[PDB]
Amino acid sequence: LEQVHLTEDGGVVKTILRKGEGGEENAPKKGNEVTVHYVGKLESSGKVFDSSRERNVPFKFHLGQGEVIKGWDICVASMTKNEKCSVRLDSKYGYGEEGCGESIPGNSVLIFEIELISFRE
Amino acid sequence: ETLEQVHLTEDGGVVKTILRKGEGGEENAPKKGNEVTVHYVGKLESSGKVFDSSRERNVPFKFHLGQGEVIKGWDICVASMTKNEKCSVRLDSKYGYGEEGCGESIPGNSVLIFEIELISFRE
Numbered sequence: 248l249e250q251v252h253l254t255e256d257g258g259v260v261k262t263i264l265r266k267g268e269g270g271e272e273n274a275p276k277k278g279n280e281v282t283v284h285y286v287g288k289l290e291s292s293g294k295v296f297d298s299s300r301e302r303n304v305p306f307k308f309h310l311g312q313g314e315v316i317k318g319w320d321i322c323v324a325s326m327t328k329n330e331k332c333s334v335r336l337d338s339k340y341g342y343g344e345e346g347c348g349e350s351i352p353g354n355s356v357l358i359f360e361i362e363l364i365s366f367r368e
Numbered sequence: 369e370t371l372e373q374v375h376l377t378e379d380g381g382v383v384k385t386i387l388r389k390g391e392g393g394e395e396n397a398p399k400k401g402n403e404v405t406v407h408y409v410g411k412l413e414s415s416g417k418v419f420d421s422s423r424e425r426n427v428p429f430k431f432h433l434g435q436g437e438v439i440k441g442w443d444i445c446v447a448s449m450t451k452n453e454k455c456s457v458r459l460d461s462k463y464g465y466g467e468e469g470c471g472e473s474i475p476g477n478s479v480l481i482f483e484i485e486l487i488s489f490r491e
């Protein structure tokens with residue numbers, strides 16, 4: 248599968264697992280509410296640190312607001328409805344030097360499988 | 369004048385101070401597995417600085433109780449609450465983010481104070 252670089256520094260690289268729907272009415276825009284399912288794991292250990300699938304409830308947020316880690320705003324802006332991708336985020340686009348809890352160490356590369364389920368204004 | 373500081377663990381690491389009593393009736397207490405809806409304000413005991421408020425962004429927080437969907441101190445605290453209860457819970461770092469902390473705002477080895485209000489719950 249082809250790697251799609253979403254920044255010039257290699258820090259956000261999206262692999263499309265399942266292509267989403269075509270057409271502009273199917274790509275979300277800045278400020279829209281998006282609904283996704285995701286599974287986040289560390290690249291280095293493969294261990295899952297957060298999963299909406301495990302909670303059995305999708306996650307909603309407003310796109311392009313900084314409500315989520317930078318790599319998520321960048322990744323989801325590139326997706327279309329029903330797309331499922333695996334995105335690799337350098338720590339610069341994740342939790343940085345600090346990390347968050349033992350399950351997200353400082354300077355960790357994160358891998359998220361993200362499925363864009365739907366969006367609305 | 370009522371101070372009620374409820375020690376929810378033997379190690380002193382989760383102490384819930386009750387600010388407003390919940391509605392009476394055991395029917396106003398959630399069970400493990402129930403989805404609960406809360407508002408919260410989180411701050412560091414050491415500096416007193418707020419690091420997050422669900423109120424400020426106007427987005428209530430929901431999770432399924434007692435399933436590890438949240439830091440352990442939260443599962444313990446919220447299991448002890450009843451509908452409309454408002455508390456301030458003190459969590460030692462072992463019930464929060466431990467030696468790692470979380471992001472720029474929460475250093476390693478931080479005691480956390482959360483004001484939590486249990487708004488509603490369901491099956």
Ligand SMILES: C=CC[C@@H]1/C=C(\C)C[C@H](C)C[C@H](OC)[C@H]2O[C@@](O)(C(=O)C(=O)N3CCCC[C@H]3C(=O)O[C@H](/C(C)=C/[C@@H]3CC[C@@H](O)[C@H](OC)C3)[C@H](C)[C@@H](O)CC1=O)[C@H](C)C[C@@H]2OC
Nearest residue numbers: 296297347348349350351410420437438439442464465470
């Ligand atoms: C794609 C979105 C991510 C997804 C984000 C949301 C659902 C939005 C939700 C309102 C989170 C807040 O978003 C503004 C924000 O809340 C804090 O400010 C906060 O006050 C906090 O302490 N909370 C939130 C309220 C419940 C308790 C606790 C928590 O249990 O949070 C959990 C938490 C961070 C657990 C870590 C996970 C890493 C482990 O290593 C560590 O292990 C110890 C434990 C949260 C709920 C995760 O389950 C889910 C997510 O992270 C964190 C300081 C940072 C966190 O944003 C990251």
